Write a protein that binds this ligand. Structure first.
Ligand code: A3C
Length: 685
């Protein structure tokens, strides 16, 4: 590992250590609504917001996202800023440059498609127009395209459930700037614990203008401080940020470098977890299935005890929804629900239904090319989801998922759509992409070495004459490396790849008759005690030779002597195999891997939990109706494997790793040449 790299890791660590209320971009629109606020004496309550606007104008006269031009974005941002500037009679030059932009550009809005269109635009846009008309700003109010949105507003305003909106919490509280006669009597009772209206600085700034409420003021005051002048279009965004950074780091395959920092993150998220789920911000009376599903999964997969009853709230009539009691469905929310529902323990019927539903939703959405999210612009959503649709979590191996995700991750070019456009530099980062591209290529270089060495070994012991095909050789190595890929873990990887090749040699050479097995087992135990049968003795020598090479290699590195335990474990497999066909092959791979771990864990081979696990892994692994029986079994394994105190964890996971490898092979074994190719033989980039 070079120094540029070592430094990149430090930086990412200083980010994770310093996560706060969210690293989000300023929203010219939202900071213009904050800047419209009267202290009480006809002066801006928030000077710094007025100042931000005067100093962050793009050179073509507009405000908004500088690297992605959207007529919807730039028009609503500039209008708001010009209004803010003009009603304090401040900064004439920039204000004028701003109106010129708006005039020359309002005509183009009529032709951009409403496919990527901001939240509450048809309502919030005419509202500014009015404010502007009533301060004598010279803009085309008649404009063929304008009298058109004035209309869409009034018609959008009649779909609104005014009754409900005032009685119970809904997402509408986020977009109040556009609405008319509101009962602030009833609305203030729907305020959030931080004094905002659904964590929106513009909506809250509006409410304060109308109520002079002291809590809305406190919230706006913290926002203005946090971002040194400007404000985002959502705040806080802390839960969302924690959960998304973790998810990206794990998918990009570089999660292990930051194991400790990631634990602080999930710790923070568990702190503000609730029985109703969560939303993007801590302490909310509103929750969404997207944030909740991402948290549920990341938590359960890391041994936090969370409950699936959390999903009861988003379901009606066997369907699931983004927000409680709203009819909103989004592609990315269902996607994250589908990923979460696969971590279902055998008792959770709510998650069986969640899986079945989110599967079809995404399935149909695919067969209509409608796999795009209106709310977010990503490099490759259809790709991410295609992978999840064909490679179930039970069959997803670290290196395979990661290999595909590094090509899909958009880095800094991903753009989120709220009321304006905004970016999340700590979730969508080019730095993470380069780090991941460099790390992935290094481990792959290392696997290419081990694979040449591994071929030589296969030739030198003439394993081809023992019934092991070159196809099996590569498949045995690929599964080992696609699962345990870290360069610092060659021992566990190699022992796995070799042990599997050898169980294949022994099984195809001596597994036919009910005593030819005995013959080999006897030969093995004779070969042991020196501290037809001719043939058996030669194979046994290959096994023993390989066993000795590895336990000594280990002892060379760590000073552990595991030789006897290696033999014992292979003898146990035979006692079992001797009676029937190829039986407990699964349990044996787990023991090998464990025995080659840099630290000692043999203590646990005795524990009931290890025994119970071993009992299941062996019912998964055996020489369409069976694929089903596999999920059944694996279901029993997932509960047991994850719900573990963190001493035993490294054992339980290892069980999962092996089981996944088998399932994956049962599901894809027939055509693996594409995966193998991309994973082992094609550098990223
Ligand atoms: C040489 C290969 C043939 C057989 C194949 C399987 C045995 C089916 C397993 C997947 C990879 C691979 C090894 C495969 C990959 C070779 N890899 C370097 C990828 C192909 O490389 P190339 O021949 O130089 O052409 P290029 O893509 O334009 O650069």
């Amino acid at each position: 590992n070079s120094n540029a790299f070592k430094e990149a890791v430090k930086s990412v660590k200083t980010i994770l250590r310093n996560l706060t209320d969210g690293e989000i971009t300023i929203s010219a629109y939202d900071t213009a609504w904050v800047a419209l606020i009267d202290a009480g004496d006809k002066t801006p309550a928030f000077p710094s917001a007025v100042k931000w606007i005067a100093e962050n104008q793009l050179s073509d006269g507009s405000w908004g996202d500088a690297y992605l031009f959207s007529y919807h974005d730039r028009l609503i941002n500039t209008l708001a800023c010009v209004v803010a500037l003009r009603s304090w009679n401040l900064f004439p030059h920039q204000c004028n440059k701003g109106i010129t932009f708006f005039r020359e550009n309002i005509g183009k809005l009529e032709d951009e498609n409403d496919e990527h269109m901001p939240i509450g635009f048809e309502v919030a846009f005419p509202s500014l127009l009015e404010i502007a008309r009533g301060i004598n700003i010279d803009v085309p109010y008649d404009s063929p395209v304008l009298k058109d949105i004035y209309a869409k507003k009034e018609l959008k305003l009649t779909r609104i459930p005014k009754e409900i909106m005032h009685k119970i919490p809904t997402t509408l509280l986020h977009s109040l700037e556009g609405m008319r006669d509101l009962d602030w009597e009833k609305l203030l009772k729907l305020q959030s614990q931080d004094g905002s209206f659904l964590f929106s600085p513009s909506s809250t700034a509006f409410a304060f203008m109308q109520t002079r409420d002291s809590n809305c003021l406190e919230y706006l005051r913290n926002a203005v401080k946090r971002f040194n002048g400007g404000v985002p279009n959502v705040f806080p965004v802390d839960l969302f940020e924690h959960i998304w950074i973790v998810d990206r780091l794990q998918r990009l395959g570089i999660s292990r470098y930051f194991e400790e920092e990631i634990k602080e993150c999930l710790d923070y998220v568990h702190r503000y977890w609730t029985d109703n789920g969560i939303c993007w911000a801590r302490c909310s009376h509103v929750q969404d299935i997207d944030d909740t599903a991402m948290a549920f999964r990341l938590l359960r997969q890391h041994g936090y005890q969370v409950s699936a009853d959390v999903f009861k709230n988003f379901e009606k009539e066997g369907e699931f929804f983004c927000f409680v009691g709203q009819s909103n469905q989004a592609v990315t929310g269902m996607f994250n629900l589908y990923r979460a529902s696969q971590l279902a323990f055998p008792r959770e019927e709510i998650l069986k239904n969640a899986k079945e539903f989110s599967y079809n939703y995404l399935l149909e959405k695919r067969e209509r090319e409608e796999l795009i999210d209106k709310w977010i612009i990503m490099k490759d959503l259809p790709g991410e989801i295609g992978f999840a649709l064909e490679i179930p979590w039970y069959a997803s191996l670290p290196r395979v998922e990661t290999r595909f995700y590094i090509d899909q991750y958009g880095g800094e070019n991903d753009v989120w759509i709220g009321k304006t456009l905004y970016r999340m530099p700590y979730v969508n980062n080019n730095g993470y992409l380069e780090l991941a591209k460099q790390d992935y290529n290094n481990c792959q270089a290392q696997h290419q070495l081990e694979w040449d060495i591994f071929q030589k070994w296969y030739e030198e012991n003439r394993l081809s004459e023992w019934g092991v095909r070159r196809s099996e050789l590569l498949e045995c190595y690929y599964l080992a490396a696609a699962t345990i890929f870290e360069s610092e873990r060659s021992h566990e990887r190699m022992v796995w790849a070799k042990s599997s090749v050898l169980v294949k040699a022994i099984s195809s050479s001596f597994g036919e008759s009910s005593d030819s097995r005995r013959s080999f087992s006897d030969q093995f135990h004779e070969y042991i005690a020196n501290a037809g049968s001719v043939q058996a003795s030669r194979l046994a020598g290959v096994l023993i030779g390989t066993l000795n090479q590895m336990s000594f290699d280990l002892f060379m590195s760590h000073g552990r002597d595991v030789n006897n335990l290696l033999y014992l474990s292979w003898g146990d497999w035979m006692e079992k195999w001797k009676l029937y066909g190829d039986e407990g092959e699964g349990e044996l791979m787990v023991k090998m891997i464990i025995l080659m771990k840099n630290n000692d864990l043999t203590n646990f081979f005795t524990h009931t939990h290890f025994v119970r696990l071993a009992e299941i892994i062996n019912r998964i692994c055996l020489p369409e109706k069976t694929i089903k029986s596999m999920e059944k079994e694996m279901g029993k394994m997932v509960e047991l494997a994850l719900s573990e105190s963190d001493t035993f964890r490294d054992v339980s996971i290892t069980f999962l790793d092996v089981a996944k490898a088998f399932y994956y092979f049962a599901l894809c074994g027939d055509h693996l040449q594409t995966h193998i190719s991309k994973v082992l033989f094609q550098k990223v980039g």
